[PDB]
RNA sequence: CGGCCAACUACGUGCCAGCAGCCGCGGUAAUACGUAGGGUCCGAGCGUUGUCCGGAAUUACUGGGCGUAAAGAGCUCGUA
RNA sequence: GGGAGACUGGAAUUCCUGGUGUAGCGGUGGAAUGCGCAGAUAUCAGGAGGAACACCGGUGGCGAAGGCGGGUCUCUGGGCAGUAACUGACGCUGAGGAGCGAAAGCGUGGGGAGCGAACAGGAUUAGAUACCCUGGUAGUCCACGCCGUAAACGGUGGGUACUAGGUGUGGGUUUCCUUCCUUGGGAUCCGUGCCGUAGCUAACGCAUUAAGUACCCCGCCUGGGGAGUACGGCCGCAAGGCUAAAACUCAAAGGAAUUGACGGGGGCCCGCACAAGCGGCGGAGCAUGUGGAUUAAUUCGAUGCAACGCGAAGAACCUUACCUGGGUUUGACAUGCACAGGACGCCGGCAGAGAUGUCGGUUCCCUUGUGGCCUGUGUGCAGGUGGUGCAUGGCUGUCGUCAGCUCGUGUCGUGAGAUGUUGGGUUAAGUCCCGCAACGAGCGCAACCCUUGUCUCAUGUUGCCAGCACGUUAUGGUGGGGACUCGUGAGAGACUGCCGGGGUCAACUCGGAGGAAGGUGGGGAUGACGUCAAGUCAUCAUGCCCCUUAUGUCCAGGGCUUCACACAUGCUACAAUGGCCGGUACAAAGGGCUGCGAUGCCGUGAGGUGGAGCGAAUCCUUUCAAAGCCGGUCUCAGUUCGGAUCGGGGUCUGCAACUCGACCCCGUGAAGUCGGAGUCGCUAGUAAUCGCAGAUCAGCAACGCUGCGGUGAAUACGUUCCCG
RNA sequence: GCCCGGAUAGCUCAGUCGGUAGAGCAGGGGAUUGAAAAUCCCCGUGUCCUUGGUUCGAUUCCGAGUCCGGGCACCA
RNA sequence: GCAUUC
């Protein structure tokens, strides 16, 4: 990437739900190349969501995504030896990447016995705006707004 | 260890094996015998000037072809040297051999022999620059030779600090696989140690 | 008897013992140290030290210099 | 803006007085001392006072130099041109001497706004008598003296004449073109710049404003340091200035220019360099190498990157180079010469740890010349994993698979050298294009070779099985079949070749079509000129040195496996994306002869027994995997996680598993709860994770190494920051 | 000699209530560096001078001893 | 911002 941006690998469409959001979620759950295991973790979590909320799982997943996606972010820059947290806008694709990474990582830190339970409950809380992933988003914006003065670097 | 041996680099393409046989079970024994033969031959006709030894085997037949600059010393007119060598050969090998003592067409195109000639001059305390230029000129006059490189390294002139000098004329495309590179190496024996002579002779391109 | 500067090799010690006018030679392979063989230059002399001139156009009359190498007074006026 | 004196103008800083008005101001890379909240900063009005004069204003003017810029007035110095009215060589230079002489400093008396040595705090730092911040005294200013130094520089003394031009600009004269516009143009005199000849110079450069060609006068130099110092003297209020040595010491100290290297210089580009991500290491246990310490010995080598699962692709004996002890000497192993043989050599017995010793049986061919052999006794000599990789060859690492490194003949320079190789563009690339005092060439780059991805043709066993027959209690099992695979031979295919837009109608570039593949398709092999006195005398070889009753050589036992610690590379874990039990699916590559070994039977199992069949596309390595998928169970617990350690009982290899092998079964059940500062790998079939095979090898310390397939991510805005 | 105050980690210093031994530097092991230093991260180090007494218990509360800082040793 | 030495 000294010679310029590299191409993004095409993501397939999930056969059960028909969202590419879902297969992106399984690629974040994916450990050690065990895709089939990650697949059923995600399917199970969406079924647990469907039974607990009654409504369509992909719709609630998208809602939870929209409540955890960061719009504004901080990038650190050394300037005169002092280090300044610089507010930078998040491009749409990065927003969803960040949101999904946050959802899965906090689900791994949750207390419920199995990952299907932890992931479904984190998705449900984030749909309501209650979860740890939502707090992370709010803290990301809090640090951006506290550093609004350093936006003039525009790096 | 910067330069791949030129012969081995081209061994499947532009040059050929110096021994032809097939054995599965006898392979180890065949190699042992070959080692013994080539050590018996490389330390016998030293002043005859040997370029190649090819060993062919089948059943018990052991055909040894010795390529030499001048076969005169490798066969006395009474057959004396052929008989002496065949005697020690069959003794060592265990079977029957047919020394096919040949001769080289263009001694001065032959990198192994050019290396021997430079080495012997250095053994006779000839200035190394002289021997280098002599070999270069002789080889380049001959019709196939499109380029030559000669390198001598060691205590050159009996100095205490090792020098490595090389002279080059023409093209010597060591990286080109299809290029026909003839390589020779010889170790000159001197009061102060050993000095190594390497010769690369480019003779054109082979397409097969 | 290294180069100036005519005349080279072996052995013995290996940064030691020593050499040297200058540059520099001795650190277990020295044409430079010590000895030997050989060689070179001189010869009833040959070397060394001291002293003066030369080379030294390096006090330059013959025969040198002063932008940056050493060298134009900080600048004027004016007496011999 | 030449100097001197007097008077005077406005902007701004500071302070003061008074409004308005609050709680911050001020300062830095970031802060803090500091000023405020008792009314600051800010804003408005008035007053005081000192210093410097924005714009004009320039590589412009004036002055001997130092120097000289608000305005006005007064007094006063110099310069230049025109006219030749006047004097008639009155000129030039000048040892000494005299005068002027930036800034700092000194004396006396004033003044003191701002600035600011010293001096305080604050910060930074290991320290910070500094740089940065807040304050702040002499001084900076005036009057009159003193001082007499500066890179007081054009580092270039003054006067005069001469020696191509071109082009700016300041001050005068004049001719023409004519509007008479006038920076119109010419000539001429006097300044001040730039560029360039000739000539000069070591070079850099100077070049009518000389560092050129010459004449007159002055000053000054004579290797670097000691030293512009001491002593003496003169001058000064002082500081100090001026004049000015020697002893002693060094073989140089210097000027200019050249090629490199380097920079906390610049420009332009790269690389998992960073950033964005994903998984690790540093914490625990164990394996392995190393340091250190032990030891009789713990053989030797490697020991920043580029030593440390490295030489070792295989240390119980052997290996083995080490230690202890026992033996042995032309030797464990060669070959030439003397001197005696007739045998050597086997196979057994006993003694010994074995080496070995001894005793019984066995035992030679041509032909008399010997021969092969040794009884053997000597003598040359063998033999050293003894030393020096800083005497070496060969082989290797490394920068770096980076794009660079050079030569021939011209040309430029006194020369080292330069040019080519720079410049503009472009590329992964010194790749190519366009220029171009260069024109070409060589080693590198690229390609040729291997492997992987597609198709065509040829061909059917041991491989394949579609279409036809015959068998299964099992399978291409079997008759057979070329049709699909596959194997291996030959060939086609990728060329920026084609189309559209960029472009020097150039390189090359961005996109599209077609195609299995697109832009060196992916990955191997391939390491230029050199560098590190890199590594290796222990693979081998080798100069020189050393040992020869040992530093050679045979053997038994021990060691290389030590252990209070430390480092490095790994493996297994800390669990539920998991552990355990049951069922079931899908590989590639490779290996096999005193070897791989199937069935069956016996063992819980390692394994035993026995041996079918295979030198193998045939047979064995199950019909070859694990992760995976389905089901059940455990339920967040130091546990049904973990599997270290230790007790008991076994198997196999081997003469032999005490030191010191692997594996199996029963029991045991340690640390470990995701690891401090810090640090490593990776850009797609990659990382992560899962098994399989091979070399070495009787057996294995293999978790190592080399290789094979299975499942398969995330992220890369970008070049500010770190490394190369 | 009299009157005070001392005496704690390798060094310089806190602590005291009768139930403690803590700071800075040094030292030791990591990390950073080509290598030192500086810096960063984990560690170790005490008859609390000696001495007896009180107390369930003494660095601590008493008396004594040794060593060391302070203020005094004067008038004829 | 800071960055001493061989
Ligand atoms: Mg001579
Ligand atoms: Mg003279
Ligand atoms: Mg003299
Ligand atoms: Mg001179
Ligand atoms: Mg002069
Ligand atoms: Mg000078
Ligand atoms: Mg002057
Ligand atoms: Mg005045
Ligand atoms: Mg006020
Ligand atoms: Mg105010
Ligand atoms: Mg004068
Ligand atoms: Mg004078
Ligand atoms: Mg002054
Ligand atoms: Mg004073
Ligand atoms: Mg004064
Ligand atoms: Mg005063
Ligand atoms: Mg200040
Ligand atoms: Mg004066
Ligand atoms: Mg002066
Ligand atoms: Mg000046
Ligand atoms: Mg001067
Ligand atoms: Mg002059
Ligand atoms: Mg002029
Ligand atoms: Mg000029
Ligand atoms: Mg000159
Ligand atoms: Mg001096
Ligand atoms: Mg003086
Ligand atoms: Mg004096
Ligand atoms: Mg990173
Ligand atoms: Mg570790
Ligand atoms: Mg760890
Ligand atoms: Mg070792
Ligand atoms: Mg390794
Ligand atoms: Mg052993
Ligand atoms: Mg070396
Ligand atoms: Mg070494
Ligand atoms: Mg060049
Ligand atoms: Mg170059
Ligand atoms: Mg060019
Ligand atoms: Mg090229
Ligand atoms: Mg290539
Ligand atoms: Mg070395
Ligand atoms: Mg040796
Ligand atoms: Mg042994
Ligand atoms: Mg070992
Ligand atoms: Mg378990
Ligand atoms: Mg525990
Ligand atoms: Mg737990
Ligand atoms: Mg890459
Ligand atoms: Mg094995
Ligand atoms: Mg793999
Ligand atoms: Mg008294
Ligand atoms: Mg020092």
Curated annotation (Swiss-Prot), chain A:
GO process terms (BP)? translation
Give the organism, scientific name.
Mycolicibacterium smegmatis (strain ATCC 700084 / mc(2)155) (Mycobacterium smegmatis)
Q: Which InterPro entries match?
A: Ribosomal_uS7 (IPR000235), Ribosomal_uS7_bac/org-type (IPR005717), Ribosomal_uS7_CS (IPR020606), Ribosomal_uS7_dom (IPR023798), Ribosomal_uS7_dom_sf (IPR036823)
Assembly and interaction partners: Part of the 30S ribosomal subunit. Contacts proteins S9 and S11.
- Give the record's GO CC terms: small ribosomal subunit
Signal peptide segment? none
Its biological purpose: One of the primary rRNA binding proteins, it binds directly to 16S rRNA where it nucleates assembly of the head domain of the 30S subunit. Is located at the subunit interface close to the decoding center, probably blocks exit of the E-site tRNA.
Which Pfam families does the UniProt record give? Ribosomal_S7
UniProt name for this protein: Small ribosomal subunit protein uS7
At the top level, the lineage of the source is Bacteria
**HAMAP family attached to this UniProt entry:** Ribosomal_uS7_B
The keyword Heme appears for this protein:
no
Q: Would the keyword rRNA-binding turn up in this protein's UniProt record?
A: yes
GO molecular function ontology, one term from the record: rRNA binding
Family membership: Belongs to the universal ribosomal protein uS7 family.
NCBIfam families in alphabetical order = rpsG_bact
Record keywords: Ribonucleoprotein, Ribosomal protein, RNA-binding, rRNA-binding, tRNA-binding
Curated annotation (Swiss-Prot), chain B:
Keywords associated with the record: Ribonucleoprotein, Ribosomal protein, RNA-binding, rRNA-binding
Add the further remark from the entry: Binds 2-aminothiazole antibiotics, which are antitubercular agents.
Q: What does this protein do?
A: Binds the lower part of the 30S subunit head. Binds mRNA in the 70S ribosome, positioning it for translation.
* Quaternary state and interactors: Part of the 30S ribosomal subunit. Forms a tight complex with proteins S10 and S14.
One Gene Ontology molecular-function label: structural constituent of ribosome
Domain named KH type-2: residues: 37-105
Superkingdom of the organism of origin:
Bacteria
- What is the name of this protein? Small ribosomal subunit protein uS3
Q: Which residues of the full protein are shown?
A: 2 to 209 of 275
